[PDB]
Ligand SMILES: NC(=O)c1ccc[n+]([C@@H]2O[C@H](COP(=O)([O-])OP(=O)(O)OC[C@H]3O[C@@H](n4cnc5c(N)ncnc54)[C@H](OP(=O)(O)O)[C@@H]3O)[C@@H](O)[C@H]2O)c1
């Protein structure tokens with residue numbers, strides 16, 4: 126189904142993908158199967174979601190049943206920041222690839238720019254809940270990740286939650302073998318990322334929008350927190366096309382040429398979320414939606430600010 130966004134490597138990244146954060150075991154498998162049936166080809170995964178082994182089962186089921194070919198799939202995973210020391214990059218990725226039951230990843234992302242204490246405690250923190258840093262940096266990680274590409278275990282590298290300063294830091298590293306093909310960040314009408322998107326696009330870096338629906342199931346959600354799916358102005362635009370709010374929030378990205386990865390394990394929503402290629406938001410509707418920016422992050426902590434390379438203090 127989906128149209129694509131051309132990467133700098135000329136690989137074609139499907140513009141709508143399936144999110145898998147918090148997709149439970151015993152539902153993520155069916156989620157993936159339904160999505161591939163509905164025409165999804167891009168699946169967004171991560172080591173830290175601890176459900177890649179169930180994602181792997183589903184992908185293998187559908188390739189073996191002729192529903193899809195491996196080369197038409199676009200599989201993305203992410204390296205967690207406790208594994209930034211070189212030998213741990215390899216062991217984490219190998220766990221990821223084995224779980225996914227694949228011979229290669231299409232894209233491997235640095236999940237978060239700050240290094241955390243190395244090892245298999247994924248969330249090292251002090252008593253007060255603040256992150257514990259490790260000395261390895263995202264540049265150390267990138268180095269070991271470039272080997273995976275040399276060996277063809279990964280077709281391309283990317284970053285996630287990077288501000289333009291840290292991408293500059295990355296692109297200006299003397300000795301860089303490969304460049305990031307995407308920057309995966311939170312993006313939606315409340316956090317429109319105009320400056321970051323402009324920046325990345327000018328450096329030949331695509332943007333992948335995460336939490337496009339305002340991530341309404343996030344466990345740290347307060348009832349006073351803004352809710353994009355219930356936003357009357359968003360709902361007004363959807364009604365105007367006889368579409369759902371989710372469909373408008375997804376199509377918003379497509380029209381900015383931004384890749385977008387709504388998560389669902391509900392078959393109807395998964396199908397709904399990819400029916401976004403039969404309407405168009407007008408120029409005035411795009412303008413209106415863009416105006417909703419209030420720099421609101423659904424995904425934030427301030428529990429790791431004390432570490433170097435915190436991405437959200439910068440303006441973009
Ligand atoms: N790189 C990063 O740091 C990072 C951070 C956050 C997220 N992620 C990626 O981005 C993906 C998407 O973001 P997200 O999971 O935070 O939240 P999201 O996709 O904005 O929203 C997910 C929530 O919306 C519900 N939903 C999905 N479609 C719907 C629809 N059509 N109508 C009403 N509700 C709907 C889902 O419910 P059901 O599942 O019950 O259907 C789920 O509760 C993640 O799954 C993950 O792959 C990456």
Ligand SMILES: O=C(O)COc1cc(Cl)ccc1C(=O)NCc1c(Br)c(Br)c(Br)c(Br)c1Br
Nearest residue numbers: 146171236237256286423424425426427428429
């Ligand atoms: O990546 C996903 O799909 C799910 O993302 C999450 C899931 C949970 Cl339970 C809690 C927080 C997030 C999240 O904010 N991720 C982006 C993010 C990460 Br990563 C890290 Br590390 C830090 Br520090 C900060 Br701040 C932020 Br913002």
